[PDB]
Amino acid sequence: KMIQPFGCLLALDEKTCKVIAYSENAPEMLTMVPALGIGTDIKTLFTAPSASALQKALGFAEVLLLNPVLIHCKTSGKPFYAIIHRVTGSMIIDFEPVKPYEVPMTAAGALQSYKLAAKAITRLQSLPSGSMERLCDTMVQEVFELTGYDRVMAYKFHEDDHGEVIAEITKPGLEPYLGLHYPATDIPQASRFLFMKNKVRMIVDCHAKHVRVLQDEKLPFDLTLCGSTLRAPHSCHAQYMANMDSIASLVMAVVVNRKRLWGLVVCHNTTPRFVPFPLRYACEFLAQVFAIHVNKEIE
């Protein structure tokens, strides 16, 4: 029930379209502090066509969900990307903030993001088969040019489930990890499914003060939120990251197919870092492609 404080979270009831859980920083972020709490209808917060654009999604099944919806707060004119997913009877929105001079550029930032992702995919296919080393080298390189982080590493999970840094690129001056071997318990099991579930997963600042999520108290159970892109890490991984002077990361999951988590393609930064939803989504596609050629060379 914790989320990172670079965006905010709102869950709604699918039938009524009324807030049934909100993150602690939502009302400061989305209104002028007409208020926001349990109960709020969403027409009272955004402009009409953002509001009208959210309600259409209720109807779309999750084989027709198209993110991000670009929204504008009613009064402030403040613009966010809204990022939807569905857990049985309930909608859950991640809002992520848009700088104002990006609003005119949102279609062609989308297009460019995929354009780089697609090209890097071409460089992948044209590679001669046989070598896991040049493949995984190309993967981490392309991801480095694509994402700008301070370090990029692939991992590979052996049958014991422990991992070996099998590939690596960094900006000049940083200590290497290429080759090293760490224990299978360094990544807990329920974390491993979560990676499998949210194909891309992002931590903007491990020293962030995290924020709480408040649900309607007339619900007899607790609502599932670990799908949200604003999922807050465990405080244990946050200290591990700070000690090793990696403060941001972005993760990609390597699921082959007999379906298994093979590995992870990862970026680490030594200062804060935020990449917006159009990129993260491009990386979903690169990840699948990479999973397919990894499985090919196993054969």
Ligand X SMILES: *[C@@H](C)[C@H]1/C(=C/c2[nH]c(/C=C3N=C(/C=C4/NC(=O)C(CC)=C4C)C(C)=C\3CCC(=O)O)c(CCC(=O)O)c2C)NC(=O)[C@@H]1C
Residues that bind ligand X in the complex, under the rule CB under 6 A? 163, 177, 182, 185-188, 191, 201, 233-234, 236-237, 240, 244, 249, 251, 264, 266
Contacts of 43 (CB under 8 A, 6+ apart): 51
Q: How far apart are CA 189 and CA 187, in angstroms?
A: 7
121 binds a second copy (CB under 8 A): yes
Is residue 8 part of an annotated ligand binding site? no
109 binds a second copy (CB under 8 A): yes
Q: Which of residues 36-55 bind a second copy (CB under 8 A)?
A: 49-50, 52-53
Task: Say if residues 286 and 121 touch (Cβ distance below 8 Å).
Answer: yes
Tokens found for residue 75: 């009064």
Residue among 2, 17, 70, 165 that touches a second copy (CB under 8 A): 70
121 vs 203 by CB, closer to a second copy: 121
3-state secondary structure of 278: helix
The CA distances from residue 206 to 24, 236, 273, 284, in Å, are 19, 10, 10, 23
User: Which part of the chain contacts a second copy (CB under 8 A), choosing from 118-126, 144-152, 192-200, 233-241?
Assistant: 118-126
Residue among 115, 123, 158, 212 that touches a second copy (CB under 8 A): 115
User: Which part of the chain contacts a second copy (CB under 8 A), choosing from 19-27, 97-105, 145-153, 259-267?
Assistant: 97-105
The CA distances from residue 171 to 154, 175, 231, in Å, are 16, 10, 28
Residue 234 touches which of a second copy, ligand X, none (Cβ within 5-8 Å per kind): ligand X
Q: How far apart are CA 101 and CA 29, in angstroms?
A: 19
Question: What is the bridge-based pairing of β-strands 211-215 and 2-3?
Answer: antiparallel
The residues binding a second copy (CB under 8 A) are 49-50, 52-53, 66-71, 81, 100-112, 114-115, 117-118, 121-122, 125-126, 278, 281-282, 285, 289, 292
